[PDB]
PDB file of C-alpha atoms and ligand atoms in Angstrom:
ATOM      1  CA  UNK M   1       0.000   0.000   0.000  1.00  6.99           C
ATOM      2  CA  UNK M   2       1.850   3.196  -0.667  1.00  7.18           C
ATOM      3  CA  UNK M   3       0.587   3.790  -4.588  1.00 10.38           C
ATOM      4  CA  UNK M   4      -3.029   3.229  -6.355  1.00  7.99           C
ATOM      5  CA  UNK M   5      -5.992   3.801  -4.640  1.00 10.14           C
ATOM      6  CA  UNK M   6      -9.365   1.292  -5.025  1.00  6.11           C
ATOM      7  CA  UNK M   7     -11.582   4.145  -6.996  1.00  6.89           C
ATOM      8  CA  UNK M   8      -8.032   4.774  -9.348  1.00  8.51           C
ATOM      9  CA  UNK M   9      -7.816   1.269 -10.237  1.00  9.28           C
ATOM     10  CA  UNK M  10     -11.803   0.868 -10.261  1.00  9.73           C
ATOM     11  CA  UNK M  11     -11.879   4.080 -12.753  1.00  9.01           C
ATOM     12  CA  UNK M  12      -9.083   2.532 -14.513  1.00 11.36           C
ATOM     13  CA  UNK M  13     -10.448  -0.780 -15.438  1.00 10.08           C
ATOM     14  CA  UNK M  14     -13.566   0.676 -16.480  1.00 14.04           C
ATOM     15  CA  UNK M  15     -11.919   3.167 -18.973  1.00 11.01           C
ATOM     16  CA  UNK M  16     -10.246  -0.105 -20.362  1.00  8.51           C
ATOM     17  CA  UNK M  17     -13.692  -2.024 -20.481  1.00  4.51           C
ATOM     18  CA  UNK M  18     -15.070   0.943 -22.515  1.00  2.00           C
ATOM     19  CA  UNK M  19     -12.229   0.206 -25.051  1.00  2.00           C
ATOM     20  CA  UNK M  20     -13.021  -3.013 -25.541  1.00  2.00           C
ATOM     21  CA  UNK M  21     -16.702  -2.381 -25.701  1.00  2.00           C
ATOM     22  CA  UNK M  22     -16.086   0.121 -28.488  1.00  3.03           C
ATOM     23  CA  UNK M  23     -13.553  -2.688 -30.116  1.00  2.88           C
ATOM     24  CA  UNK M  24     -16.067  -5.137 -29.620  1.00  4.56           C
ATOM     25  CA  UNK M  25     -18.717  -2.469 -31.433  1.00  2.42           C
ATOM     26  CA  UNK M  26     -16.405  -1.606 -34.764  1.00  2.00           C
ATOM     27  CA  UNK M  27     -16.414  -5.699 -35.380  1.00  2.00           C
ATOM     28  CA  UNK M  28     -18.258  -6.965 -38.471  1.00  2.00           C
ATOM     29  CA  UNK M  29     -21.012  -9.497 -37.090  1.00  2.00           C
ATOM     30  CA  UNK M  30     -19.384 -12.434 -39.633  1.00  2.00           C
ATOM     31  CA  UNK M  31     -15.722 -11.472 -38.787  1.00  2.00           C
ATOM     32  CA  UNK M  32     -16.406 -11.369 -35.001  1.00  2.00           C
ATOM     33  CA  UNK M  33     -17.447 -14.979 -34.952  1.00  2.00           C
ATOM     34  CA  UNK M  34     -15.108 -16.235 -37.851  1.00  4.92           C
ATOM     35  CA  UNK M  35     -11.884 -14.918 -38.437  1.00  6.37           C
ATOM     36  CA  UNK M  36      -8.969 -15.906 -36.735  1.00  3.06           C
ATOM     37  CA  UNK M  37      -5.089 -16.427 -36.868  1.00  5.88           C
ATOM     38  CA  UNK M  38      -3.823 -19.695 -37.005  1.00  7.63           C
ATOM     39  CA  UNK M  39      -4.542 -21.790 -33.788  1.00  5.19           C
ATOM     40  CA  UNK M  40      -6.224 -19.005 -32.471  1.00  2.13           C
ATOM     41  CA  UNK M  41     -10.069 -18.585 -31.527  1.00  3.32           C
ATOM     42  CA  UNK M  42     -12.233 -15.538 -33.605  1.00  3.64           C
ATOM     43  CA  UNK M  43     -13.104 -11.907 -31.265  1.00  4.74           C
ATOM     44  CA  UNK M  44     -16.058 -14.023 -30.020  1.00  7.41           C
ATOM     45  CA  UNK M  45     -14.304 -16.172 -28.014  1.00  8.22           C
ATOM     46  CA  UNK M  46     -11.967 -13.743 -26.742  1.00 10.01           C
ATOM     47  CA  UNK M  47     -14.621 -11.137 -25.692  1.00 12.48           C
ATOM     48  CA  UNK M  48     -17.083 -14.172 -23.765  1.00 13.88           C
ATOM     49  CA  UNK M  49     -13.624 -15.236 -22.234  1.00 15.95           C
ATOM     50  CA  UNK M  50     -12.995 -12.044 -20.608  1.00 13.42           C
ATOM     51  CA  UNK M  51     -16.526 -11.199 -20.043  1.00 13.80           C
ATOM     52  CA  UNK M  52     -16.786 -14.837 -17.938  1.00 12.91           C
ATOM     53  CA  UNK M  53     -13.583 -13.508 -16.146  1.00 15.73           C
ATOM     54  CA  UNK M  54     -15.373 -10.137 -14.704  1.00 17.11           C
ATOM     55  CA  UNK M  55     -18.555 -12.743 -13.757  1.00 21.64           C
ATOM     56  CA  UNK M  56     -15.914 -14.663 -11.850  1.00 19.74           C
ATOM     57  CA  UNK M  57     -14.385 -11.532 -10.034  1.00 23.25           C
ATOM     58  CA  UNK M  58     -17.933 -10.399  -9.259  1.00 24.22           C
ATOM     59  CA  UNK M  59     -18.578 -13.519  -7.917  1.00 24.15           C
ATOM     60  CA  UNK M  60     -15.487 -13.277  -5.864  1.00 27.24           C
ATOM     61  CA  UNK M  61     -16.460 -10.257  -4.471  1.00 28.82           C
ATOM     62  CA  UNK M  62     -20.184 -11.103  -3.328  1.00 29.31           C
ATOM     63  CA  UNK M  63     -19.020 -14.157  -1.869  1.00 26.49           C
ATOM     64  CA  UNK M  64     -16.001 -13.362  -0.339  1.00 23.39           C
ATOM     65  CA  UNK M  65     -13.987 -16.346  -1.621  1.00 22.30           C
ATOM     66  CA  UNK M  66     -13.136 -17.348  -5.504  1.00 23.01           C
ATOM     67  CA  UNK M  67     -15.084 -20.240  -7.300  1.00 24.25           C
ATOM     68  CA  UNK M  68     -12.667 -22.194  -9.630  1.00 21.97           C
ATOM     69  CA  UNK M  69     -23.544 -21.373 -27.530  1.00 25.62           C
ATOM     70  CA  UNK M  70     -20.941 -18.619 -27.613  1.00 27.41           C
ATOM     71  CA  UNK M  71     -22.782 -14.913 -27.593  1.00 26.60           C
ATOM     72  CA  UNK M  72     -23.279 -12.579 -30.654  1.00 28.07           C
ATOM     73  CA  UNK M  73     -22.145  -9.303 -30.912  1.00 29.35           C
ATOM     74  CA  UNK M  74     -25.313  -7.561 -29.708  1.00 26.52           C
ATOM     75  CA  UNK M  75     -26.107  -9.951 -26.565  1.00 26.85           C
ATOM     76  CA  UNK M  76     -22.734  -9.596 -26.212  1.00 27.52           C
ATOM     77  CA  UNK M  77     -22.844  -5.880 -25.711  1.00 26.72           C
ATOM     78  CA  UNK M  78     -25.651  -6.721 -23.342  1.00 25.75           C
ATOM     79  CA  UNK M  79     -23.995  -8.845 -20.996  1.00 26.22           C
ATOM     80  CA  UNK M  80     -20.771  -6.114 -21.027  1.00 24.14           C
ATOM     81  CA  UNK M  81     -23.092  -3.005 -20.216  1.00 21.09           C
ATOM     82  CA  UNK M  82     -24.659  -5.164 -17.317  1.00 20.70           C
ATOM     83  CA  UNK M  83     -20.729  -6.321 -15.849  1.00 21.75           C
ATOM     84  CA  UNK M  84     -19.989  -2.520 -16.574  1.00 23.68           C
ATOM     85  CA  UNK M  85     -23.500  -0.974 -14.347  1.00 23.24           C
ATOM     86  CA  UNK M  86     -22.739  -4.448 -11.683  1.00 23.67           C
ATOM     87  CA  UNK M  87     -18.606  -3.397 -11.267  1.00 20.68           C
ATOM     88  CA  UNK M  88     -19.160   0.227 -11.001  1.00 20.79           C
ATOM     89  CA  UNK M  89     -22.139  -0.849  -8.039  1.00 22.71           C
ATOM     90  CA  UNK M  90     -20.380  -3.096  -6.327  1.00 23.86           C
ATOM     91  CA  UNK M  91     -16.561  -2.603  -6.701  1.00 23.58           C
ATOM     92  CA  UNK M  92     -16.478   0.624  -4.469  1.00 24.36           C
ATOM     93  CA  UNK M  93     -18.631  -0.928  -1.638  1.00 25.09           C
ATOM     94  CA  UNK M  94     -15.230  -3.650  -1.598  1.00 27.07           C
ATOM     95  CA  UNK M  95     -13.362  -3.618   1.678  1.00 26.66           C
ATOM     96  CA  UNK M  96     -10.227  -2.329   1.177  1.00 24.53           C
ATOM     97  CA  UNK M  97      -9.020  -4.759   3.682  1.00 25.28           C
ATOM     98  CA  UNK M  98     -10.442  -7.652   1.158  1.00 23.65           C
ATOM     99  CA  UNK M  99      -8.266  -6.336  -1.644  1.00 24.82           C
ATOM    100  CA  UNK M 100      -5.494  -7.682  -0.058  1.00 21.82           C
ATOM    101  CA  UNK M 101      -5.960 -10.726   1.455  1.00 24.17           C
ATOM    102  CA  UNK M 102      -4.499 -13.519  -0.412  1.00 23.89           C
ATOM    103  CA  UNK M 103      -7.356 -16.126  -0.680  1.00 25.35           C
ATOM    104  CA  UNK M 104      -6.182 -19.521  -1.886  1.00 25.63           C
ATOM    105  CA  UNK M 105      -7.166 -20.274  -5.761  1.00 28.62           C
ATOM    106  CA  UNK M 106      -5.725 -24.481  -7.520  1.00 28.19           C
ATOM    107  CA  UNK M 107      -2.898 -22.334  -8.219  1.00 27.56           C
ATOM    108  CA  UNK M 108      -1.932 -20.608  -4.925  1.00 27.63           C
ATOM    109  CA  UNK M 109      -2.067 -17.816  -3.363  1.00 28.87           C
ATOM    110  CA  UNK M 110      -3.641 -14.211  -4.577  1.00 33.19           C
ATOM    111  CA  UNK M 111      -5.112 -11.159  -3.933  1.00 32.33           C
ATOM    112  CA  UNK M 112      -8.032  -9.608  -5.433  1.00 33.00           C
ATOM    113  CA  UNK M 113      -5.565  -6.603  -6.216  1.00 30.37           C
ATOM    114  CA  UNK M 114      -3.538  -9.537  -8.011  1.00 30.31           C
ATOM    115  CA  UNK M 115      -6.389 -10.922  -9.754  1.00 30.16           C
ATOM    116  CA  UNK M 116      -8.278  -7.610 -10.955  1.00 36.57           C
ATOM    117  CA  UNK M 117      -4.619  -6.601 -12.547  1.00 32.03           C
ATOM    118  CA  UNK M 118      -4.229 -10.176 -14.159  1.00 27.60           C
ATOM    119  CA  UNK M 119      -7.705  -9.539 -15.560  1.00 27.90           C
ATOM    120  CA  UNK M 120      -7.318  -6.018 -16.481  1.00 26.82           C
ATOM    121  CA  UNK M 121      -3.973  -7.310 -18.913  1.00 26.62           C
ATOM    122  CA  UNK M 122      -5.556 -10.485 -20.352  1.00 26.28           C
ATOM    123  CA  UNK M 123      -8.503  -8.270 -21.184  1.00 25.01           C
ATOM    124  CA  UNK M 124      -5.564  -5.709 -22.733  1.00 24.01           C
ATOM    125  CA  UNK M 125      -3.716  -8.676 -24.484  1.00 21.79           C
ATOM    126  CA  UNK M 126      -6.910 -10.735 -25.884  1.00 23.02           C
ATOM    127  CA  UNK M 127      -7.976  -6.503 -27.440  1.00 25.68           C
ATOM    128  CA  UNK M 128      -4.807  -5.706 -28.858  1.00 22.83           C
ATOM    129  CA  UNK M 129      -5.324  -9.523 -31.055  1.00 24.91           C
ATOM    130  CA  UNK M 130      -8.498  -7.691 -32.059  1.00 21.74           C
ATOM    131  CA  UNK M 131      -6.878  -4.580 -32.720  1.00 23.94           C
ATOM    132  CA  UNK M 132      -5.027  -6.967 -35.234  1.00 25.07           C
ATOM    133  CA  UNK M 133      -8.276  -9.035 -36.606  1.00 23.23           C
ATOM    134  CA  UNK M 134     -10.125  -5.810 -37.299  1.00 22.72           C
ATOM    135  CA  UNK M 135      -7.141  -4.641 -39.451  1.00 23.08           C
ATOM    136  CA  UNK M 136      -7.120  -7.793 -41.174  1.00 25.08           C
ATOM    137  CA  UNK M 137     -11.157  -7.286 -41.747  1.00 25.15           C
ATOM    138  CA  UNK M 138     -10.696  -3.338 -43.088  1.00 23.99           C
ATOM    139  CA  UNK M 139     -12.073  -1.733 -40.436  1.00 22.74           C
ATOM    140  CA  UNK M 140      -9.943   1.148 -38.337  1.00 22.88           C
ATOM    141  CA  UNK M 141     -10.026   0.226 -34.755  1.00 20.21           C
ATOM    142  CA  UNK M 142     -10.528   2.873 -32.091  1.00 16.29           C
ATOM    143  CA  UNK M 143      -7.493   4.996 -30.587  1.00 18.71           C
ATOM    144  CA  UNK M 144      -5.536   3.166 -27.864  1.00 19.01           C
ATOM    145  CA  UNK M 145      -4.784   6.016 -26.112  1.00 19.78           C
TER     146      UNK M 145
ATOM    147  CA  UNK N   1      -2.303   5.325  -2.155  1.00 17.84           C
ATOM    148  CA  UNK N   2      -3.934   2.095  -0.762  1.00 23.12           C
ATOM    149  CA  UNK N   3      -3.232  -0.553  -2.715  1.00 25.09           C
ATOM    150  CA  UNK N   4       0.259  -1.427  -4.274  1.00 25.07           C
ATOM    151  CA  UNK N   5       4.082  -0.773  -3.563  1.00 21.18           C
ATOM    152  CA  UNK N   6       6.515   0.115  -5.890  1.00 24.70           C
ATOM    153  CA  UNK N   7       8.330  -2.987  -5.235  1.00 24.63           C
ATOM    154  CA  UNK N   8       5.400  -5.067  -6.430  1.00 26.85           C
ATOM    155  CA  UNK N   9       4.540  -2.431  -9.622  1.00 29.96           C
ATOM    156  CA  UNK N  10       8.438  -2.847 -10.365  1.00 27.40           C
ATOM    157  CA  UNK N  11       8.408  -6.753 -10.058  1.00 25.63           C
ATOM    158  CA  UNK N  12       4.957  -6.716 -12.396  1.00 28.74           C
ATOM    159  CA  UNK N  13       6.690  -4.548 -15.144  1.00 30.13           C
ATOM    160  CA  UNK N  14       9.624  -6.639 -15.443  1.00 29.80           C
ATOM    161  CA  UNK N  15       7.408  -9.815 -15.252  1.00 32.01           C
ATOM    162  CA  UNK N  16       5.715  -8.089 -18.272  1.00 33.20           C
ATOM    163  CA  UNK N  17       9.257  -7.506 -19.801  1.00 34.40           C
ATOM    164  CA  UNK N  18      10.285 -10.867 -19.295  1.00 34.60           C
ATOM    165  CA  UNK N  19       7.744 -12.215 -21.261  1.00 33.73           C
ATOM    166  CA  UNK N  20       8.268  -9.679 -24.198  1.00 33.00           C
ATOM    167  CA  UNK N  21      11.413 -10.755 -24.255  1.00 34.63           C
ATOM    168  CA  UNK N  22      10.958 -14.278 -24.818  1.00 35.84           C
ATOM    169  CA  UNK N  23       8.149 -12.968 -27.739  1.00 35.37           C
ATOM    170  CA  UNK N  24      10.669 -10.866 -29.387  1.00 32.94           C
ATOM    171  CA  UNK N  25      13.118 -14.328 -29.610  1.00 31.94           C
ATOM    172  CA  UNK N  26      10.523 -16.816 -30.756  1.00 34.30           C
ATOM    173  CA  UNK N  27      10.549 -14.124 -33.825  1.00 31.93           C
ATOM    174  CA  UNK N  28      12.165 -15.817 -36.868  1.00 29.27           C
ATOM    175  CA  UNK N  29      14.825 -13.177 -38.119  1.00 30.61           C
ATOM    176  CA  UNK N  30      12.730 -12.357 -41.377  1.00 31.17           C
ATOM    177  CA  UNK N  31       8.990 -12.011 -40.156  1.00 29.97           C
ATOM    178  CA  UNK N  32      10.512 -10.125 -37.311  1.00 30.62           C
ATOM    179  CA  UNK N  33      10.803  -6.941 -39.464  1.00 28.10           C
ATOM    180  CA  UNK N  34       9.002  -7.873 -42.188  1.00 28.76           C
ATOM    181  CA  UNK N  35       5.859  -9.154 -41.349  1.00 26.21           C
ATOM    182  CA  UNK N  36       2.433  -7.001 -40.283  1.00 23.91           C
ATOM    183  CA  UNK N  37      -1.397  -6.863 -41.212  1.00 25.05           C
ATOM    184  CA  UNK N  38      -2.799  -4.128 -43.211  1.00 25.45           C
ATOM    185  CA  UNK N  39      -2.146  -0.624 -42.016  1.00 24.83           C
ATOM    186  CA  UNK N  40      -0.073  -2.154 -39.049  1.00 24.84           C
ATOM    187  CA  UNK N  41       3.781  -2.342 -38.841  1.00 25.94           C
ATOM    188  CA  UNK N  42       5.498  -5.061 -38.357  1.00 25.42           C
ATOM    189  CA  UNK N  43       6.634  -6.479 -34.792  1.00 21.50           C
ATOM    190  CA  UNK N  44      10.178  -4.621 -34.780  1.00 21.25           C
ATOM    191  CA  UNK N  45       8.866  -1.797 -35.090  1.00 20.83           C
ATOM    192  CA  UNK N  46       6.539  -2.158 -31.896  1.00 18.55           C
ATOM    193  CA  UNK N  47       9.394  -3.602 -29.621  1.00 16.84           C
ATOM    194  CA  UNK N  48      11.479  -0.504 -31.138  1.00 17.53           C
ATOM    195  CA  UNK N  49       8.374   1.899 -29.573  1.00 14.15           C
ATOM    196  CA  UNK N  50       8.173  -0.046 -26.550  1.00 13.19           C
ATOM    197  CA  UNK N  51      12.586   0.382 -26.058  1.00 11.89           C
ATOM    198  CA  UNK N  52      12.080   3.684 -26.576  1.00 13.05           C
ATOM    199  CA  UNK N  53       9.417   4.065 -24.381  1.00 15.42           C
ATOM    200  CA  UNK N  54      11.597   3.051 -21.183  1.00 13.68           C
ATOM    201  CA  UNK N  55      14.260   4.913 -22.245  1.00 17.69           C
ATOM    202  CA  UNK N  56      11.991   8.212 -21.585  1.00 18.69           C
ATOM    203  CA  UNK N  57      11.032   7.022 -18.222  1.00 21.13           C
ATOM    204  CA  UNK N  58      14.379   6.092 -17.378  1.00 18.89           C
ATOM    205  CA  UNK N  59      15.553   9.298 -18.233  1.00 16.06           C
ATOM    206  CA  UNK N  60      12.330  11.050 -16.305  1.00 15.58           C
ATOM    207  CA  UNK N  61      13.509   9.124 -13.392  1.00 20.62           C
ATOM    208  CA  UNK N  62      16.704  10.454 -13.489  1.00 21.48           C
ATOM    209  CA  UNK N  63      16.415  14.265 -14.544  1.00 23.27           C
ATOM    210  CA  UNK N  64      13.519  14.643 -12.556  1.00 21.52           C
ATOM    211  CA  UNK N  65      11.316  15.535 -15.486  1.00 21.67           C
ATOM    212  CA  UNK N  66       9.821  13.701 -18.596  1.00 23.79           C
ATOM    213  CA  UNK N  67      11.455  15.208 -22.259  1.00 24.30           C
ATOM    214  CA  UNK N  68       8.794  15.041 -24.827  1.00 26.92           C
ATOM    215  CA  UNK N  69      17.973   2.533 -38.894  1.00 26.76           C
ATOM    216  CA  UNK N  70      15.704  -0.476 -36.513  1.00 25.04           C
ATOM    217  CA  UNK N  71      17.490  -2.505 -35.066  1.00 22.42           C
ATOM    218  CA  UNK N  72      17.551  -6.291 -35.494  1.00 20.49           C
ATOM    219  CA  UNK N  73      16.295  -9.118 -33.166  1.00 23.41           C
ATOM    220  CA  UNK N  74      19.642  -9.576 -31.743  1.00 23.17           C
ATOM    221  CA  UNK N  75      20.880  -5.554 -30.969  1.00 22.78           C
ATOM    222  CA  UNK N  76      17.407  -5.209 -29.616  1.00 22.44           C
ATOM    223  CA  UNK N  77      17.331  -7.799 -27.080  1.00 19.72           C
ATOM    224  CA  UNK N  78      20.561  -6.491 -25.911  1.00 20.04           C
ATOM    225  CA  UNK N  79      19.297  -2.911 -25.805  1.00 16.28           C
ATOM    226  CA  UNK N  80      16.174  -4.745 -23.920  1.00 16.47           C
ATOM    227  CA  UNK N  81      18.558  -6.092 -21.277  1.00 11.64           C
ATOM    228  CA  UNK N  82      20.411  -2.907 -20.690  1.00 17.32           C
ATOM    229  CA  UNK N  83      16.974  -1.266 -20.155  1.00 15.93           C
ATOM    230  CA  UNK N  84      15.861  -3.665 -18.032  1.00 18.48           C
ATOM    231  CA  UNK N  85      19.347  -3.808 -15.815  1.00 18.95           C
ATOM    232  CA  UNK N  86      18.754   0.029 -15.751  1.00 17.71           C
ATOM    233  CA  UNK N  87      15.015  -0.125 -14.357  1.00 19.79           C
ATOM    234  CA  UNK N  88      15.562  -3.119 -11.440  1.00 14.89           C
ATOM    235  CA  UNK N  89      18.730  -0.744 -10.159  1.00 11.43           C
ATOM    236  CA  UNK N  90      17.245   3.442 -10.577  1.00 14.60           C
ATOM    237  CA  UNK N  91      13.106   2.481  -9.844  1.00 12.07           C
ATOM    238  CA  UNK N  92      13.701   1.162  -6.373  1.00 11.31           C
ATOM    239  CA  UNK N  93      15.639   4.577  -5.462  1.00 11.65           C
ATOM    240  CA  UNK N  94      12.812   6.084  -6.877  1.00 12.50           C
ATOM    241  CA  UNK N  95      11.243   8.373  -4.453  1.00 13.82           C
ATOM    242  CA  UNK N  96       7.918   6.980  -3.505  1.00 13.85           C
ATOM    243  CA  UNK N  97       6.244  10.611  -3.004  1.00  9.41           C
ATOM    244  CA  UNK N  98       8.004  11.293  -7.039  1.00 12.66           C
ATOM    245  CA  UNK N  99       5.291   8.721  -8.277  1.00 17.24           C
ATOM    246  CA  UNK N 100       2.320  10.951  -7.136  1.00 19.40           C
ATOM    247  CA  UNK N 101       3.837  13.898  -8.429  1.00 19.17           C
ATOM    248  CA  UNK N 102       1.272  14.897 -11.749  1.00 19.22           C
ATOM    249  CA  UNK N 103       4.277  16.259 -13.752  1.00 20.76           C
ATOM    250  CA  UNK N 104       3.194  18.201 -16.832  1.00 20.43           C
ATOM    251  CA  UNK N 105       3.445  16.898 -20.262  1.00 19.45           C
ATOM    252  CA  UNK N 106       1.798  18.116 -23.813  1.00 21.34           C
ATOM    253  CA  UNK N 107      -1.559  16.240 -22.803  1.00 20.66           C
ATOM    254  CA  UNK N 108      -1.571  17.603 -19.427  1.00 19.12           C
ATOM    255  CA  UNK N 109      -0.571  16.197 -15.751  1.00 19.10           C
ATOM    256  CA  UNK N 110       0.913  12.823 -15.222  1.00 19.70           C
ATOM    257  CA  UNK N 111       2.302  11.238 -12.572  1.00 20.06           C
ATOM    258  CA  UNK N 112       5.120   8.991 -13.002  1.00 19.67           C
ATOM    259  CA  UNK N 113       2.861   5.897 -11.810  1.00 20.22           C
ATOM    260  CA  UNK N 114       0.257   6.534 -14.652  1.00 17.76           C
ATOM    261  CA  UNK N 115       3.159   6.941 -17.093  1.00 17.93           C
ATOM    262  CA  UNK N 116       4.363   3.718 -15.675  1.00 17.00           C
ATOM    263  CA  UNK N 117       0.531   2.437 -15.901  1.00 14.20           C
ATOM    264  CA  UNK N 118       0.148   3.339 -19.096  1.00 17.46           C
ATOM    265  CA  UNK N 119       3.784   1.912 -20.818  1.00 16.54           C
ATOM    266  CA  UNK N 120       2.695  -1.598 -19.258  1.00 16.98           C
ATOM    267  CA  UNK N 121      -0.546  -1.726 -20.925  1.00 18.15           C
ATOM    268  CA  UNK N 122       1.292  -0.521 -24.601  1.00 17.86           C
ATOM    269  CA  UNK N 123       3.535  -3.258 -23.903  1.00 19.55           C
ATOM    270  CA  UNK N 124       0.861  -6.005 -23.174  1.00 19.93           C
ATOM    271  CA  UNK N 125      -0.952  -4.743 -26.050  1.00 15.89           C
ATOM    272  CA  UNK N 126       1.841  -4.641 -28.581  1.00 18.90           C
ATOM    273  CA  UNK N 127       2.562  -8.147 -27.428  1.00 22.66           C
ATOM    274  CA  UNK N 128      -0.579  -8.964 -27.885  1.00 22.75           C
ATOM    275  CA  UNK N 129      -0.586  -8.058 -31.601  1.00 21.55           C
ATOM    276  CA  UNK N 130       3.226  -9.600 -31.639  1.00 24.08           C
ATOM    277  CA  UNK N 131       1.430 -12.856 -30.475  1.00 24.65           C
ATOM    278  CA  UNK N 132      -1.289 -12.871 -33.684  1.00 22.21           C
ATOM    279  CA  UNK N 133       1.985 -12.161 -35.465  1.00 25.87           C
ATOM    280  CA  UNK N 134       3.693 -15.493 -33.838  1.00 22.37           C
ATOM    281  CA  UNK N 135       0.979 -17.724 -35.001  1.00 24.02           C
ATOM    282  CA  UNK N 136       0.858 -16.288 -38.567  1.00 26.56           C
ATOM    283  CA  UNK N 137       4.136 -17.492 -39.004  1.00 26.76           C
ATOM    284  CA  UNK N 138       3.901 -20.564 -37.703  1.00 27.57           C
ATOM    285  CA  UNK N 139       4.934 -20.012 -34.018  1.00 24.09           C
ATOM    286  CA  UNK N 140       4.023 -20.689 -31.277  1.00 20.31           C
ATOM    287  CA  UNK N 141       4.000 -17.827 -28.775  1.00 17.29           C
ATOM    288  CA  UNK N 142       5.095 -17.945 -24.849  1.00 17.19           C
ATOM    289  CA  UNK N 143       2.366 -18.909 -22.422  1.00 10.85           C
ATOM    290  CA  UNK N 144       0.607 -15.508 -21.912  1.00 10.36           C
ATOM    291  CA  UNK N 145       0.005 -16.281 -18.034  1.00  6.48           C
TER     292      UNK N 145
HETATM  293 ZN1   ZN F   1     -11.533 -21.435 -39.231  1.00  8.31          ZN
HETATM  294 ZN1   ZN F   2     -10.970 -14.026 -41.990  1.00  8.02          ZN
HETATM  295 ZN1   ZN F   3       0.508  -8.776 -15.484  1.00  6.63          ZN
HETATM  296 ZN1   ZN F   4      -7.092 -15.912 -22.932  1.00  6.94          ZN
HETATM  297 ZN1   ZN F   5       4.569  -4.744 -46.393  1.00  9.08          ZN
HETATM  298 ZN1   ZN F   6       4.011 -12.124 -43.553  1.00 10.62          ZN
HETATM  299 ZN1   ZN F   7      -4.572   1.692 -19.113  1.00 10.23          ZN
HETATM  300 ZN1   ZN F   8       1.979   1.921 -30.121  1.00  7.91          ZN
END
């Protein structure tokens, strides 16, 4: 504890979610299920991937301890504006304390800081292979910055 | 100021490094600096950004205040390891207080932990794009986690 405050990181995650969401918007509806690079899945995959990851973090969060057909681009958007609306309700009310404590995943050992930052750069990685598919489809994806 | 230490934020980074190290040398030689998707460039350029990109907080670090050919695989992965000798020995005498500091740049203030915030999540994105890049050419990429 010395550097990033809970409503930083909070404000932060959701400026990256918005990215994604706007990524996720400037797909084509048959490139977002179907093109991919070699041994790789499509955007669809991706997006429901990291989308499952914030229900898993939610879930984290309500209960206090970690639990260890694929979407189209509109229910898609659906299910992101609801994480979006359910992270910016519930994230805040987190104990500060809780961020912290290292609760015990198949793994070993982690945070929720720990876990929120490993989901906040898969969710960075998985959009920057997007960035990549929607130049390979002709579209312009949004600014990064 | 709540949740991480620079000594964590410093071990993340050059976790993060790490890995884009071992991306940049499961390049082959030729796709390397050759190969890209439409209106990209191709992965030497990126790791060439990214380089350049610690050099200029490096050199914040030290004067106090941010200053606003490509090389091959090999010269870069040596330039990569004398940037990353430089950051594990001059960020730990960084002065905690100096990373809440908003120091003015063009865009406006910044502290040095946004900066810092901010070249981590060009780097996982550029990797990111450098992984699509791996599997077009018939690579397989480092484990992302
Ligand atoms: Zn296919
Ligand atoms: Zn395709
Ligand atoms: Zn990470
Ligand atoms: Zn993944
Ligand atoms: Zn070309
Ligand atoms: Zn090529
Ligand atoms: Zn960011
Ligand atoms: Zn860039």
């Amino acid at each position: 504890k010395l550097l990033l405050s809970p409503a930083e990181l909070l404000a932060h995650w959701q400026g990256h979610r918005d990215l994604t969401r706007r990524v996720i918007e400037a797909f084509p509806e048959e490139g977002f299920a179907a093109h991919h690079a070699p041994d790789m899945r499509p955007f669809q995959a991706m997006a429901c991937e990291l989308a499952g990851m914030v229900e898993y973090q939610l879930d984290w969060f309500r209960r206090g301890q970690p639990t260890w057909e694929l979407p189209g681009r509109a229910e898609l958007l659906a299910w992101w504006d609801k994480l979006t609306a359910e992270l910016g309700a519930e994230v805040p009310q987190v104990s500060t304390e809780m961020w912290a404590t290292p609760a015990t995943t198949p793994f070993g050992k982690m945070s929720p800081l720990m876990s929120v930052m490993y989901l906040i750069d898969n969710e960075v990685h998985h959009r920057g292979q997007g960035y990549v598919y929607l130049r390979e489809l002709g579209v312009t994806p949004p600014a990064f910055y």
